[PDB]
Design a binder for this molecule. Structure first.
Ligand SMILES: CC[C@H]1OC(=O)[C@H](C)[C@@H](O[C@H]2C[C@@](C)(OC)[C@@H](O)[C@H](C)O2)[C@H](C)[C@@H](O[C@@H]2O[C@H](C)C[C@H](N(C)C)[C@H]2O)[C@](C)(O)C[C@@H](C)C(=O)[C@H](C)[C@@H](O)[C@]1(C)O
Lengths: 1022, 150, 100, 50, 50
């Protein structure tokens, strides 16, 4: 084939024009987003029960729904929450590549049949299923400049003019409002009310008839009377449209000629829908808007188009609707992909910067410059063909293998222009003979590199795909090179070919090292060992090194989690958020751009006593010295905060990929397997918890991710009592309810939009137990009766967040392995510590520790097969149950050095280093196949032999193994190794190869020929 | 898909069903006609009844063998328990009560009712202290149901 | 209906939600004045209809709770749809033993 | 599907009451196994008979 | 405050037209290359496609 193509090279340009054309077409139509789909598809069902409590929410709703999540395919486990805010969250996680579009249907469809068993009041707010993809593209945030607008105001404008505006913008797959949207409040008053002999029920049943909207025919339309000239629609009752319009409501007419208005009993006033979240931005009222990708979209195109549609409206934005961007992914992805592409462009210059310095030529260097951006800037076509997307993972996926497709250009044009040079034919005729020596061992390395790579995207799941990206990009790049190295380049340097200060200074240094290579081969026992002692150093080094996923990186933002104690208050929470606010602003303004501070939602719960702080940093420019970065700022924050009294205020950095897992600890669920109560499970948990701290040999931080029980205010409605007075349980309940819980009456139209109408007492007459008194209820007689008449009141304990795993009461336990042991052993212990627990209590592993469990560690199993497809592949390239064994033992040499960036650098066993540690073996073994070919090659063709042929090999061979190894440790050692701008990965890519690409050459040249000698000879006894 | 469609046109008749027949719950499945296997549950101790062995199974094992992928249908060879109120029509007659009464009672006296909060969801001036107001909960024994007030 | 107070009351909601579904090409809608809505979603030539149907029905599940309870009692029907009748098999009674 | 039904049961047996035992009154899986796995014996035995 | 668009037959029709240039171009380009490969020359195809 390469011989056929050298003669017809006019065609081998066509072949390359396309690769390009198509490689380019892909580029100009590929998805760009930070990461791809890596978490298993999850479907969260979530509902509201206005003013409930975990128990109620649980046994009135969450249970029901769970008891119905059957007959749905591909479900892994079901997790559920019931807290004291009136809210339920049930999350069904689904097997790996279950189609999430059809997993949502199934869930949801099974819910629609349960709906009629939920309470009429949950059915109203509406239960709703979405696709759990906690991977935000960005979050805008409309703030008001002058102190004109409030939370609820800003909120309303946002979801009313710009909301749908964004919603329908080229590549936004979900928009999610960050606030209420005006709602008709009707803030009752037990006194203004008890005076007119009315209760809330009476208020309730007015908003209904006063605010309804009923039909009545047309005129003709439906069967008219013989001959008719007019048909037109009737318009009966409409819905109210104003605060004042609502205020004017008949509530009752007494003997007096006077009645009661709605205004008279309460406070009508437009306002917010729900009041427990306080979006505050750099001190000011905010009310943002979060936006998710779209699927096939472009985190950069739509990134822009958000900013475009956000203009246009800035004229229409009133007083000060100054839009801010307290979180955007767009910058990080750009100036990480404007890297990477940089590395190739450069590592290209490096192959032109070498090449010259090793071959005086210009038309020699100017062929890999027209061979690499073929493969590379064209393997993109294979990517794009397979649904893949330009992203952090697939991007580096190439950078990590740029060295393996460089060494495919150098290697050929070397043994073409130093096969003619070593006394021989013209250009055409040289390439013809010179290719015939490598022709085979490229097809050899091809299949041998399909192995040691393909057996990756066969891994676990959540991190299975994390890998697969790497695997497929590489094998695609790798295979495309071996092709251009058998079609284009070897029919190009045959029609292109033919620094001075040097040249002869190399021709001396070959013999200077071929000194001891040509020696030590009389008997090889020190070289046979030391190797046996490299195989160890590594085996002792492998273990030592700690494992991990993608390393935390300095993304634009980071977070601070405030958690006030037990009974705390949003206000008691604000004052703490206000210090956080402040510490960050005036005390760090050379790094901090903004704090978007939300209280009324945290991590462990959704309390009033909790908050979170999104602090988004200055541009990476204004953040120079390494102590102006995240790792540092959090340190300087987390401490400076460990001084607020009662208020755990921790600061932390986002993980690798937001919507994935986390720190190589465990996620552990304690289940209740007999009718054992909360107050029984809680003990079981506390046993284990305590029994777990007692073993700091492998523990760190075993803990409940839930919340401990709090005091609560029971109101025991005496039944007998209620009956004897003319007092109805339904009237009682509703007033206690609606006073304090609030209640969604119905809907009304305001400024052309539908909006809810809530009715609930002023906060003045609903703060303290000593406040109940106030509330009275009409009776049989028609007389106002106090709760004091028909209820008792006592304090007591009840969880404000009840939890369940797989429809069975759970409590979730988090914990790490403790500086020391392996992720695996922690789990292994925990399980034991769990066996001793009171009969009827079980455990399960979820999330990260479900992945680990059901995805063993296929590395040994898989690479067994690869390491066997290698020998099997390799052997038959040659002709031996023997010779391949000289190529294989080249593995260790690259493992070390790479592993020896456990020493000179303080890093871990990344997924990156896990995969750079493969691109190294790729070169390592490839040399081992070329040298070991050139040893069997001229030991058959010229017909040489023994220690002559093994020297004859590494002789004509060395220089390539130098040109390329140099080219790499240059193009792989720029800001890749020593950075500051989305570093992490860069460094993990680098040190992986770089050092370890050292020992994979400047240690393999003195070595591989040994490998061809101790083998072969040992297969000829007596 | 087929399932998706059936259920989607079913959904249009759902509001036209008797309240009672909703309350029971309609069901839509994609199952094979015939049983894959039958799973038996016995008590050797003689310590339980049919009565219990069913109810155990239902509360404790059915639910998940159900959500287990590939199981398009589960048949329960029995029933899980319920609070049973075997009325007596003479007894009812003496005290001058119908089943309607009995019912209205059970309804309002066996309830679970959101009574909001102390901390107020929006608050006042400046207030510490915030806790859940807990009204009625669901009776949970023969004993409790019995003590109802007719 | 009341036409304006049917759009805005149902259509603005259903429409709010058909935001961002794979291969959406153009959607067009109309209130009525007998209280009637036809949202239509037209997807990229070639796109899979049955999935389209599914997502359209998945986003409805979200609009749905936020619409008049009499509109809910009704239906809200989501289905794949053509525009032109393939045929119109009519039916007459010869010998007037049946009226229209 | 049987595979798992067996593992879901498994998972929940350590917590039954007194003398509560699973029993296998009927199953169409075991035959379907033995079936192919004896018709696979007809492959080996008949190659070791060529 | 008054814009426009095509739907139905129109949207399809328009989007047929806008497209054509792209069609003929990339199509010609494909024929050139197919000849280069085949008739050994980098510019006899330049001469066929005249
Ligand atoms: C062996 C033992 C089983 O018998 C069968 O498998 C036969 C062979 C089915 O027909 C087989 C074969 C066949 C062709 O039916 C004759 C096919 O239509 C069905 C789906 O499976 C029967 C009869 C089905 O009924 C049919 O259900 C149809 C939905 C409509 C039809 N009808 C009222 C008009 C009706 O007779 C159906 C659902 O299995 C009966 C339900 C009650 C069962 O699950 C019962 C317990 C069966 O598993 C079984 C008794 O254990």
């Amino acid at each position: 084939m390469p011989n056929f193509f050298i003669d017809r090279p006019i065609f081998a340009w066509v072949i390359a024009i396309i690769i390009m054309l198509a490689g380019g077409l892909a580029i100009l139509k590929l998805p760009v987003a930070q990461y791809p789909t890596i978490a298993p598809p999850a479907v969260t069902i979530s509902a509201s029960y206005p003013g409930a409590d975990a128990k109620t929410v649980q046994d009135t709703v969450t249970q029901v729904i769970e008891q119905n999540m059957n007959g749905i395919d591909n479900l892994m486990y079901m997790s559920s929450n019931s807290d004291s805010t009136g809210t339920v969250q049930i999350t069904l996680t689904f097997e790996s590549g279950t189609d999430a579009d059809i997993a949502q249907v199934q869930v949801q469809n099974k819910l629609q049949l349960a709906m009629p068993l939920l309470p009429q009041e949950v059915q109203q707010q509406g239960v709703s299923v979405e696709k759990s993809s906690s991977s935000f593209l960005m979050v805008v945030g409309v703030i008001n400049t002058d102190g004109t607008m409030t939370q609820e105001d800003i909120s309303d404008y946002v979801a009313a003019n710009m909301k749908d505006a964004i919603s329908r913008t080229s590549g936004v797959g979900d928009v999610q409002l960050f606030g209420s949207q005006y709602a008709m409040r009707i803030w009752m008053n037990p006194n203004e009310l008890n005076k007119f002999q009315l209760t809330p029920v009476d208020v309730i049943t007015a908003i209904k008839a006063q605010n309804a909207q009923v039909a009545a025919g047309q005129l003709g339309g439906t069967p008219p009377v013989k001959g008719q000239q007019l048909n037109a629609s009737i318009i009966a009752q409409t819905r109210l449209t104003s605060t004042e319009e609502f205020g004017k409501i008949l509530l009752k007419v007494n003997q007096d000629g006077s009645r009661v208005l709605l205004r008279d009993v309460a406070k009508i006033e437009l306002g917010g829908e729900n009041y427990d979240i306080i979006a505050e931005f750099n001190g000011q009222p905010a009310s943002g808007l979060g936006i998710k990708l779209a699927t096939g979209a472009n985190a950069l195109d739509t990134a822009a188009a958000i900013r475009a549609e956000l203009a246009k409206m800035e004229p229409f934005f009133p007083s000060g609707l100054k839009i801010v961007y307290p979180y955007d992914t767009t910058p990080f992805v750009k100036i990480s992909i404007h890297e990477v592409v940089k590395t190739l462009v450069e590592a290209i210059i490096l192959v032109f910067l070498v090449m010259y310095l090793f071959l005086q030529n210009f038309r020699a260097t100017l062929i890999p410059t027209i061979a690499v951006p073929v493969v590379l800037l064209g393997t993109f076509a294979v990517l794009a063909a397979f649904g893949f997307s330009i992203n952090t993972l697939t991007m580096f996926g190439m950078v990590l293998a740029i060295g393996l497709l460089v060494d495919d250009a150098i290697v050929v044009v070397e043994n073409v222009e130093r096969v003619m040079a070593e006394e021989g034919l013209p250009p055409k005729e040289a390439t013809r003979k010179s290719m015939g020596q490598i022709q085979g061992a490229l097809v050899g390395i091809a299949m041998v590199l399909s192995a040691v790579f393909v057996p990756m995207a066969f891994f676990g799941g959540s991190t299975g795909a994390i890998y697969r990206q790497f695997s497929i990009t590489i094998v695609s790049a790798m295979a495309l090179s071996v092709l251009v190295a058998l079609i284009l380049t070897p029919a190009l340097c045959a029609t292109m070919l033919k620094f001075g200060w040097f040249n002869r200074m190399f021709e001396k240094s070959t013999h200077h090292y071929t000194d001891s290579v040509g020696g030590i081969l009389r008997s090889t026992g020190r070289y046979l060992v030391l190797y046996l002692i490299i195989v160890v150093g590594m085996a002792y080094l492998f273990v030592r090194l700690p494992s991990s996923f993608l390393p935390d990186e300095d993304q634009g933002v980071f977070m601070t989690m405030v958690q006030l104690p037990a009974g705390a208050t949003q206000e008691r929470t604000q004052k703490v958020l206000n210090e956080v606010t402040h510490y960050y602003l005036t005390k760090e303004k050379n790094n901090v751009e903004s704090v978007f501070a939300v209280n009324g939602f945290g991590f462990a719960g959704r309390g009033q006593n909790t908050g979170i702080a999104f602090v988004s940093l200055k541009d990476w420019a204004d953040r120079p010295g390494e102590e102006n970065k995240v790792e540092a700022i959090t340190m300087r924050a987390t401490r400076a905060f460990s001084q607020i009294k009662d208020a755990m205020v921790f600061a932390f950095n986002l993980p690798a990929i937001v919507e994935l897992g986390t720190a190589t600890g465990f996620d552990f669920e304690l289940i209740d397997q007999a009718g054992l109560g909360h107050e029984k499970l809680t003990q079981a948990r506390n046993q284990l918890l305590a029994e777990a701290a007692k073993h700091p040999d492998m523990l760190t931080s075993v803990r409940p991710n839930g919340l401990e029980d709090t005091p609560q205010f029971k109101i025991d409605i005496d039944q007998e009592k209620a009956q004897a007075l003319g007092v109805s349980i339904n009237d009682i309940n509703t007033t206690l309810g609606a006073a304090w819980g609030g209640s969604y009456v119905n809907d009304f139209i305001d400024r052309g939009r539908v909006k809810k109408v809530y009715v609930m007492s002023e906060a003045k007459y609903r703060m303290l137990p000593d406040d109940i008194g106030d509330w009275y209820v009409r009776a049989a007689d028609g007389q106002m009766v106090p709760f004091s008449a028909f209820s008792s009141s006592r304090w007591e304990y009840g969880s404000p967040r009840l939890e369940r795993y797989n429809g069975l009461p759970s409590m979730e336990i988090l914990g790490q392995a403790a500086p020391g042991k392996s992720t695996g052993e922690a789990m292994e212990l925990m399980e034991q510590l769990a066996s001793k627990l009171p009969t009827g209590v079980g455990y399960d592993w979820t999330g990260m520790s479900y992945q680990e469990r059901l995805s063993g560690n296929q590395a040994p199993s898989l690479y067994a097969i690869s390491l066997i497809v290698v020998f099997l592949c390799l052997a038959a390239l040659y002709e031996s149950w023997s010779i391949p064994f000289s190529v294989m033992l080249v593995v260790p040499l690259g493992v070390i050095g790479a592993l020896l960036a456990a020493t000179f650098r303080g890093l871990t066993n990344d997924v990156y280093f896990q995969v750079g540690l493969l691109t190294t073996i790729g070169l390592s073994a490839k040399n081992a196949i070329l040298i070991v070919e050139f040893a069997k090659d001229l030991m058959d063709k010229e017909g040489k032999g023994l220690i002559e042929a093994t020297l004859d090999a590494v002789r004509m061979r060395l220089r390539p193994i130098l040109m390329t190894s140099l080219a790499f440790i240059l193009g792989v050692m720029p800001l890749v190794i020593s950075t500051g701008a989305g570093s992490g990965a860069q460094n993990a890519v680098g040190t992986g190869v770089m050092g370890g690409m050292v020992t994979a050459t400047v240690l393999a040249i003195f070595f591989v020929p040994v490998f061809f000698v101790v083998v072969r000879r040992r297969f000829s006894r007596k």
